[PDB]
Design a protein around this nucleic acid. Structure first.
Length: 1092
RNA sequence: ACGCAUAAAGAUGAGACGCGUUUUAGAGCUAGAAAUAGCAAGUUAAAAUAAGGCUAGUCCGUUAUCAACUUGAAAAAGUGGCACCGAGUCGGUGCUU
DNA sequence: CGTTTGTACTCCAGCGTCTCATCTAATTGCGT
DNA sequence: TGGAGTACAAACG
């Protein structure tokens, strides 16, 4: 018999339906097996799979990189301890050890409690003399006396461990923090160079530039307000180049500097400024201006006093906190004695004592303390500081995120240079320590694997271990840098194994220009004319017009080659460029000038050709750049056999374009078959979009194949799919390739099965036209009905009685039975919640390491179960230790399944069970389905919780009525329909009571939440008087009691009603467990009451 | 002015920064039998950031895939009759296994 | 009297900013 | 979101 399949793909559901030539759905008597006494069930060919949505890989990468950074930060300190290790034995042979025993409780320490000095008086003196680390950093920088080696190490480790951002290149001159006023010096120098004496207006201080939020709008407005400059060089158009990345990247200035580019004042600036060098300070002052605007912004100290600006800022940031605390204590105690014992003694409010010791941030502390400062007398300076957001600040606060590492380098350099003459091993290791601080792995070399990585691409110049001091002697940077881009670039589609040509490659240029000119006709343009036209026009003219100059040449005798011309300007040797014996040299150059960007690999690669052309040409070309990868490889256009490029260069009927030349002639048709070559699990990688659709496609294929398997393996006639978009074009190919695997008398496909695709406008119009209204809040049958209607409308459209069929449509929409299925799944993810709880005496705490007992150290909490196993055994009951037989359900967590699947018997024994019976172990994943009396179903959600399992089969008349009242005004859309709709809905009201009765009966049968039903009924009785719309708007909310899935709270007009949480897992240990196939038609029932 | 480089959505990979938690170290004092009472103080550091693994690397550990049962180490293959009259989570009648 | 267990009721969970590279695919400024 | 954890009072031996 003929039939068709309808489908409806989604992000969380896949409706499937089967219809014969008549639009009704067939039914069959499917067999069941197990230890039950049932043998058959009769089911309808309708269903709807449901599943959990997939997710993106981002959140895993964001932790993988963090794991790498934590694995490297320990190695840096390991190197530094190694350097000190030869001498530290003469001072404190255990210093590095107490620093590791520091974390753990006093009972488990092997050495003394005090980390630094190991005895009480010295530790107290140390904390008395240097209240923070910064008072030590500054002391070491500003001193000429021998420091103790422990202090030097402790200061150095702080900077090597915390080292600031690497985002600024070149040097920073520390004293430029003082010279922020040099705006007048800038305009002065601009006046000296531009002797026309531009405006020297000084009425606006640089302070307004530094203090403001100097966005482009603010920068421009403030700059133009202070200087209506007579030329752009004195205003924003140049000062942006002087203080920010250039928006005028081209034509940065027209008068000086060759009219050439500058971009963002990188380290490359020192050579990009050669345009100014060749034709000339206006451009020198930018350096000091930027240094000033940075340092004077971050540093609150004029550095003329000291070499260590940051240590000098933080001391003042500490002193003001002390001086304000001592004042505020006195004021609060004098004016409000009742608040003193709250603010300064609590640890729960947002007060000061709740800001140090609690978790309170700066923002909420100010929010709390503003009023007490405001209404009290004499606090004006505190109000000023608070409005500036500099009141009671901590040193290591959240906003240190902008300090650059040159400051740390400058401090460390002097720290070494003051002490090296007393401790010789520092003298010959300075270059090593400073290297440890500054060393960084380049972004294109990647992980330093040895072949085991799934990610790495690095290649080695030697088989040796990498350290900071010999990185470039072991990694071969050129090969890694090339592979970095070669890894990601895609392959040629026509022969899927060779790399693609760059867009600017010269062979590609010839190919394109020949393919263009061969189509010129007047009769096709013969070969000698090809040579003449190309040599005259395309090798001389920088933009040959499409039309005119060809006609000019024609009348004289009787789309661009850009890279050729750019090379012609870069190197003037005409016959060096225009020679075949140099084509394979220049092609490498055109590749290098697009494969690299860092201006070091280009030196690395071009250097072999330095003899072949003079210095100036080489230095000019080194700065050139190209970008873009094309479509075709070398093998497809040339080399493979005369080649195709030769045929294009030939004369006669070879003028046929590539796309036709390769296609018609067997001699060149041969390539497309000789290397023509794939399963779904890698074809799916070609699909664009998020994984959320890939999952739906994958499930849809399985559903289709298994439906075909059920139906006696006769192929379906038509398949209708639903989501001008590529994805729905790809899915059609995915289905039809598998379906039509059959070949005709010409060895090509036979269309056994047709694939069709629709758009939702038709089905929505059908809904509105024939009043098959959909309400999304009641039950999950809409997926199946949608799929069925898709199949109906698609088959009707492709075949093309409405006065006869609608009865069948009505009944199949009204059928009570629909094969809803939820996909079982083993859980994957993190072991437990991340928050490290404080120590508690409860035993739920999970140890954070092997030998850190949670009772003393705290730890994680609330782990997650992977799957649950039914176990039957004997357990030791009572003080008399009776080995009572027990049947029990146990949960296996993600952390444990590795051991469990390795050895179930010893794990179940370690749980405490004795004499467990092996073959009675069952695996029960999440969402396993159980059936109990009266059809009361429950799904497992964990070892100790359940979920509902039933669908409410509300009749069609009620959903039809509720549709006409869930929307009243917006639903109208037309007066002639509205009048009769209003006349209809008004003439009966008892349907509200019918809905209440239905919900009450269904809840009494299967939900068993009677208290909430009583509350609902009482509230409905209370509000019976309200108009019909007000009733309906919350009657729609009322079905949240009966819907499938985990229970959740909802609200009724004034009353919130809380969720009921089933927990009685014990009631299930004797229910009929159901195993289902994906479609749900094939079933297996295990009766747990026959076991144990 | 039709044109395409464009911004504005994503997908994937690599390189660095700033915080936040947890446990110790920073000798609280006085009057009282104690409970309690009065006052003083507060800003920093070390160690860990999925338990761990063997391939021993400056490497790997949260994405994707997964009813039963027979065979197969596994991949993988294979295993469940039809017509008719009716509907409250699917029934019944008939034929043939 | 002592124990297990059943219901109703809270309170809760790691986060923000940089640089670089490739791809797809639908969009618009105003190129002239 | 929806699941683990704490604190509370009644049925059963």
């Amino acid at each position: 018999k003929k039939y068709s399949i309808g489908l409806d793909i989604g992000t969380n559901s896949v409706g499937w339906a089967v219809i014969t030539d008549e639009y009704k759905v067939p039914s069959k008597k499917f067999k069941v097996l197990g230890n039950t006494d049932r043998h058959s069930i009769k089911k309808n060919l309708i269903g709807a799979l449901l599943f959990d949505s997939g997710e993106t890989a981002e959140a895993t990468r964001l932790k993988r990189t963090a794991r790498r950074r934590y694995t490297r930060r320990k190695n840096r300190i390991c190197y530094l301890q190694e350097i000190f290790s030869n001498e530290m034995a003469k001072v404190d042979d255990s210093f590095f050890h107490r620093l590791e025993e520091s974390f753990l409780v006093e009972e488990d320490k092997k050495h003394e409690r005090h980390p630094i000095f190991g005895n009480i008086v010295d530790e107290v003196a140390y904390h008395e003399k240097y209240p923070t680390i910064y008072h030590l950093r500054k002391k070491l920088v500003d001193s000429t006396d021998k420091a103790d080696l422990r202090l030097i190490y402790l200061a150095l480790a702080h900077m090597i461990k915390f080292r600031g951002h690497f985002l600024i290149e070149g040097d920073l001159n520390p004293d430029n923090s003082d010279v922020d006023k040099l705006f007048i010096q800038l305009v002065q120098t601009y006046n000296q160079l531009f002797e026309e004496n531009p405006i020297n207006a000084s009425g606006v201080d640089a302070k307004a530039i530094l203090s403001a939020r100097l966005s482009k709008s603010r920068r421009l407005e403030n700059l133009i307000a202070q200087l209506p400059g007579e030329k752009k060089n004195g205003l924003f158009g140049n000062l942006i180049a002087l203080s920010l990345g250039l928006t005028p990247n081209f034509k940065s200035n027209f008068d000086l500097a060759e009219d050439a580019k500058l971009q963002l004042s990188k380290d490359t600036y020192d050579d990009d400024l050669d345009n100014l060098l060749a034709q000339i300070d206006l451009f020198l002052a930018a350096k000091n201006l930027s240094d000033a605007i940075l340092l004077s912004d971050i540093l609150r100290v004029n550095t003329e006093i000291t070499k260590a600006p940051l240590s000098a800022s933080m001391i003042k940031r500490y002193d003001e906190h002390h001086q304000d605390l001592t004042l505020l204590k006195a004021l609060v105690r004098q004016q409000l004695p009742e608040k003193y014992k709250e603010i300064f003694f609590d640890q729960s409010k947002n007060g000061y004592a709740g800001y140090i010791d609690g978790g309170a941030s700066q923002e909420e502390f100010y929010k709390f303390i503003k009023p007490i400062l405001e209404k009290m007398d004499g606090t004006e300076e505190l109000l000023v500081k608070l409005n500036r957001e500099d009141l009671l600040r901590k040193q290591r606060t959240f906003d240190n995120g902008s300090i650059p590492h040159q400051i740390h380098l400058g401090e460390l350099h002097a720290i070494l240079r003051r002490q090296e003459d007393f401790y010789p091993f520092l003298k010959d290791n300075r270059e090593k320590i400073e290297k440890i601080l500054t060393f960084r792995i380049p972004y294109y070399v990647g992980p330093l694997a040895r072949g085991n990585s799934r990610f790495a691409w690095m290649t080695r110049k030697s088989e040796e271990t990498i350290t900071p001091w010999n990185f470039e002697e072991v990694v071969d940077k050129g090969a890694s840098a090339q592979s970095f881009i070669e890894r990601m670039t895609n392959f040629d589609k026509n022969l899927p194994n060779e790399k693609v040509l760059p867009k600017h490659s010269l062979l590609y240029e010839y190919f394109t220009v020949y393919n263009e000119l061969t189509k010129v006709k007047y009769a096709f343009l013969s070969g000698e004319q090809k040579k003449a036209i190309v040599d005259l026009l395309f090798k001389t003219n920088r933009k040959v017009t499409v039309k005119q100059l060809k006609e000019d040449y024609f009348k004289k005798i009787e789309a661009s080659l850009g890279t050729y011309h750019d090379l012609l300007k870069i190197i003037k040797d005409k016959d060096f460029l225009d020679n075949e014996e140099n084509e394979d040299i220049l092609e490498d150059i055109v590749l290098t000038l697009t494969l690299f960007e860092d201006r070091e690999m280009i030196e690395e690669r071009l250097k072999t050709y330095a003899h072949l052309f003079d210095d100036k040409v080489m230095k000019q070309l080194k700065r050139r750049r190209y970008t873009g990868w094309g479509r075709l490889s070398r093998k497809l256009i040339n080399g493979i056999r005369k080649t195709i490029l030769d045929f294009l260069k030939s004369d006669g009927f070879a003028n046929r374009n590539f796309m036709q030349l390769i296609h018609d002639d067997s001699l060149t048709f041969k390539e497309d078959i000789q290397k023509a070559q794939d399963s779904l699990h890698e074809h799916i990688a070609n699909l664009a979009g998020s994984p959320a659709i890939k999952k739906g496609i994958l499930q849809t294929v399985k559903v289709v194949d298994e439906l075909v398997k059920v139906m006696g393996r006769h192929k379906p006639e038509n398949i209708v799919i639903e989501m001008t978009r590529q994805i729905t074009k790809h899915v059609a190919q995915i289905l039809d390739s598998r379906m039509n695997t059959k070949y005709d008398e010409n060895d090509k496909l036979i269309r056994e099965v047709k694939v069709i695709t629709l758009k939702s406008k038709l089905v929505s119009d059908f809904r509105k036209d024939f009043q098959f209204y959909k309400v999304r809040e009641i039950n999950n049958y809409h997926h199946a009905h949608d799929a069925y209607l898709n199949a109906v409308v698609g088959t009707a459209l492709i075949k093309k009685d409405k006065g006869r069929d609608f009865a069948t449509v009505r009944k199949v929409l009204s059928m009570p039975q629909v094969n809803i299925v939820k996909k079982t799944e083993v859980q994957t993810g993190g072991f437990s919640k991340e928050s490290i709880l404080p120590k508690r005496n409860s035993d739920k705490l999970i140890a954070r390491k092997k030998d850190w007992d949670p009772k003393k150290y705290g730890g994680f909490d609330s782990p997650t179960v992977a799957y649950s196993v039914l176990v039957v055994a004997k357990v030791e009951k009572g003080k008399s230790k009776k080995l009572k037989s027990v049947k029990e359900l146990l949960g296996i967590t993600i952390m444990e399944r590795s051991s469990f699947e390795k050895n179930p018997i010893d794990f179940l024994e370690a749980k405490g069970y004795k004499e467990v019976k092996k073959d009675l172990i069952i695996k029960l994943p999440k969402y396993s389905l159980f059936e109990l009396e009266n059809g009361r179903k429950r799904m497992l959600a964990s070892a100790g919780e359940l979920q509902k399992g039933n669908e409410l089969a509300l009749p069609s008349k009620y959903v039809n009525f509720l549709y006409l009242a869930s929307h009243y005004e917006k639903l109208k859309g037309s007066p002639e329909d509205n009048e009769q709709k209003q006349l209809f809905v008004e003439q009966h009201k008892h349907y509200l009571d019918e809905i209440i009765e239905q919900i009450s009966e269904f809840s009494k049968r299967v939900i068993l939440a009677d208290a909430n039903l009583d509350k609902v009924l009482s509230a409905y009785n209370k509000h019976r008087d309200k108009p019909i719309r007000e009733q309906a708007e919350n009657i729609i909310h009322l079905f949240t009691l009966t819907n499938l899935g985990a229970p959740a709270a909802f609200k009724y007009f004034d009353t919130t009603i809380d969720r009921k949480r089933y927990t009685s897992t014990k009631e299930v240990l004797d229910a009929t467990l159901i195993h289902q196939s994906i479609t749900g038609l094939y079933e297996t029932r295990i009766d747990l009451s026959q076991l144990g």
